[PDB]
């Protein structure tokens, strides 16, 4: 963890761990 490869569910869960209950504005390579 902390510095690693991350994809799909693992990247979504890492974003929820980093951002907390506020979540993320990102969408998985959809326009962003």
Partner 1 sequence: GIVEQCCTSICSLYQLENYCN
Tokens representing 8 are 């799909």
Considering only residues 2-31, where is the footprint of partner 1 by CB under 8 A? Answer: 2-8, 11, 14-15, 18-19, 22-31
Find the shortest distance in angstroms from Cβ 21 to partner 1: 10
Q: Number of residues interacting with partner 1: please give it, by CB under 8 A.
A: 23
The tokens 């693992």 sit on which residue?
Answer: 10
**Which positions touch partner 1 (CB under 8 A)?**
2-8, 11, 14-15, 18-19, 22-32
């Amino acid at each position: 963890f902390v510095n690693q490869h991350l994809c799909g569910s693992h990247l979504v869960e890492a974003l929820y761990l980093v951002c907390g209950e506020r979540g993320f504005f990102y969408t998985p390579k959809t326009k962003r």
